[model samples]
Target: SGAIYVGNYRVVNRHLATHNDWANLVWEDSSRDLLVSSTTAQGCDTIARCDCQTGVYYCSSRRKHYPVSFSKPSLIFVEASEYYPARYQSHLMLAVGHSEPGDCGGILRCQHGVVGIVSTGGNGLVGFADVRDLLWLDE
Candidate 1:
């Protein structure tokens, strides 16, 4: 399984993957990394994972598995109505709800059944692709 992407969490060079795709993500976290997951449903609890490379990161809003330390390492699954909260704060702003709180000023794309993640540093970008085009092997 993949790590849960917290809506309040932020990371540089962030990426999303399911199943064993974390290999690439972990590789990118050359300077420590952390991940947290939570589910509102019963039988599941919020858990945190830490990967200490050589730096420090912090997430204080939610409960975690490890103590406050610098050892960083790290979704939502919905159908047509699916919503991935991890990237929720990075979702649509150029369209849908223009300039909303989560708006990243990026475009949401779904061409050829492939989706792209949000862009970095912008108020007028394209991102937050709908699930109909997200989660598939990138092309």
Candidate 2:
């Protein structure tokens, strides 16, 4: 019975275990500062950080994004574009990791996917830099 609470009652790992997206919990201590935790996506190496309490994650850039890990990050734009030329410019997203195609399951979008967001200009080929980063907001 020696545990501290985050919200109303005591916060336990069991409560987090059931979470669909559970990263990690680190405690260094900082008055009212935010507690940040990060994780890599299943099909990409992009590191998505979030506030433990708020559940707001920040996505990195996708311009020239070359992640080392294959288990997490997906293929680069050049490759994805070559593979899916028709849907490259359409499915292309910025800052947010776009689901090009996953081997596990689920089909990817063809044009202007739901995951990728607009950035800078309206054009996809020129505006978007094509970095590999995706900021998520877990509500």
Candidate 3:
């Protein structure tokens, strides 16, 4: 199974650590070259992949064999009564109240279905994808 999205929690906590995906975003250096530092707390994660909300790149990190340190994005299954049904990840676009577990932004869903990790620079930006539509697959 894929790692939980940015706002999801496993079977335990209903509440989650406070996080801002767009707040601490930054860039950093990697063994390959310059790469987007993961916005997540864990150095890297799988089921819990990172992403760039700018729609600039995609993410596809490794699945947490034993729950990597990164927290799952808040999750809420879309409501059946809503206007339309949730697509593969279309629910991500649902309004805030629909977040299964819950999230900060209510009207807008910032998280998207990504397959990798992301990072940001302390001074500026952390990117998750390279020039192409690829996820800068390094793993």
TM-score of each: 0.21, 0.14, 0.19
Q: What overall lDDT, based on C-alpha atoms, would model 2 receive against the true structure? A: 0.22
| TM-score, prediction 1 | 0.21
- Give the worst 10-residue stretch by lDDT in candidate 3: 90-99
* Total clashing pairs for each candidate: 16, 13, 37
* Candidate 1 per-residue lDDT over residues 35-114, each given as its tens digit: 22222333211222222222111112122111221111112221221223333232221221112223221222222221
Residues 39-64 of candidate 3: C-alpha lDDT, one tens digit per residue: 33332222223443332122122111
The alpha-carbon lDDT assigned to residue 124 of candidate 1 equals 27
* Candidate 2 local lDDT, 1-139, one digit each (tens): 0122222222121212223223454321121111223334322222223211111111233322221111122222332222233222322223223222111111112122212112222222211212122233221
Question: Highest TM-score, which number?
Answer: 1
Per-model lDDT: 0.23, 0.22, 0.24
lDDT of 1 at 91: 27
Off by over 4 Å in 2: 1-113, 122-126, 129-136
